[PDB]
């Protein structure tokens, strides 16, 4: 449509739609003229009966439905943090996605499929000191796809790099 497009920002495991990093990314989308939404996956994450990271299939299906709806109105950018990145990437494989912004993406997901993504612009922010997702794993995944990769001196939460991550997202949106 008239609008340059819509950003769907997916929070990490046991986080929620008002968490710091997705809220920061929503402010970037706002300031850059994109519409945006932060879906709530907290119910799904609480479903331990379906796995140690909850109902991940449910997360994937919920995001797929939301993205599909959005693509029937105009371009869609998917972004996330950690588990949110994993599902954004997987969903890009199922809906036409303009670009993908991934904070601390896990490359492995137990018995679920390994991280993959559509062959569209990908920008990643990862922590050198991530205790959960070794930096080498994200470096290898990004290298295979020549995805833009920003490594910062932080751990998995990226708690000291919310502005750096916001700027990387802005740079991605400004390129589209």
Binding site for its own copies (CB under 8 A): 128-129, 135, 139, 142-143, 146-153, 164, 167, 171
64 vs 164, beta carbon nearer its own copies = 164
Integer angstrom CA distances of residue 72 from 139, 146, 154: 34, 29, 38
Residues 117/144, Cβ–Cβ less than 8 Å: no
Least gap, CB of 94 to Cl ion (angstroms): 22
The entry of its own copies, Cl ion, none near residue 32 (CB within 5 to 8 angstroms by kind) is Cl ion
* Cβ atoms < 10 Å from Cβ of 113: 11
Find the shortest distance in angstroms from Cβ 102 to its own copies: 14
DSSP run (H or E) holding 57: helix 56-71
Does 48 bind Cl ion (CB under 5 A)? Our answer is yes
Minimum CB distance to Cl ion, residue 87 (Å): 12
The distance of closest approach from Cβ of residue 120 to its own copies in the complex, given in angstroms and rounded to an integer, is 13
Q: What are the phi and psi torsion angles at 142 (to 5°)?
A: -65, -40
Question: How, if at all, do strands 6-10 and 35-37 pair?
Answer: parallel
Minimum CB–partner distance for residue 133 and Cl ion (Å): 15
Closer residue to its own copies (CB): 133 or 149: 149
162-174 helix and 20-31 helix, angle to the nearest 10 degrees: 40
Which of its own copies, Cl ion, none is residue 22 near (CB under 5 to 8 Å by kind)?
Answer: Cl ion
**Which 124-153 positions form the footprint of Cl ion (CB under 5 A)?**
148, 152-153
- Is residue 116 within 8 Å of 91, Cβ to Cβ? no
Report what 157 binds from Cl ion, its own copies, none; CB cut-off 5-8 Å by kind: none
Find the angle CA(27)-CA(30)-CA(33) to the nearest 5 degrees.
150
Which residues would be at the binding site for Cl ion (CB under 5 A)? 4, 11-12, 15, 19, 21-22, 26, 32, 36-38, 48, 52, 81, 148, 152-153, 173-174
């Amino acid at each position: 449509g008239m609008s340059r497009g819509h950003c769907i920002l997916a929070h990490g495991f046991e986080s929620g739609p008002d968490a710091l990093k997705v809220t920061a990314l929503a402010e970037v989308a706002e300031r850059l003229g994109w519409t945006h939404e932060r879906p709530d996956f907290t119910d799904l994450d609480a479903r331990r009966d379906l796995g140690q990271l909850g109902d991940v299939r449910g997360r994937l299906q919920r995001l797929l439905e939301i993205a599909r709806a959005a693509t029937e109105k105009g371009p869609v950018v998917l972004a996330g943090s950690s588990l949110g990145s994993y599902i954004a990437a997987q969903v890009s494989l199922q809906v036409p996605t303009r670009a993908l912004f991934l904070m601390v993406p896990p490359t492995k997901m137990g018995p679920l499929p390994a991280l993959d993504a559509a062959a569209v612009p990908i920008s990643i922010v990862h922590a050198w000191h991530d205790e959960l997702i070794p930096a080498a794993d994200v470096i290898a995944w990004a290298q295979a796809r020549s995805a833009r990769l920003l490594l910062v001196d932080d751990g998995h939460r990226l708690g000291a790099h919310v502005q750096a991550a916001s700027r990387a997202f802005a740079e991605l949106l400004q390129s589209l």
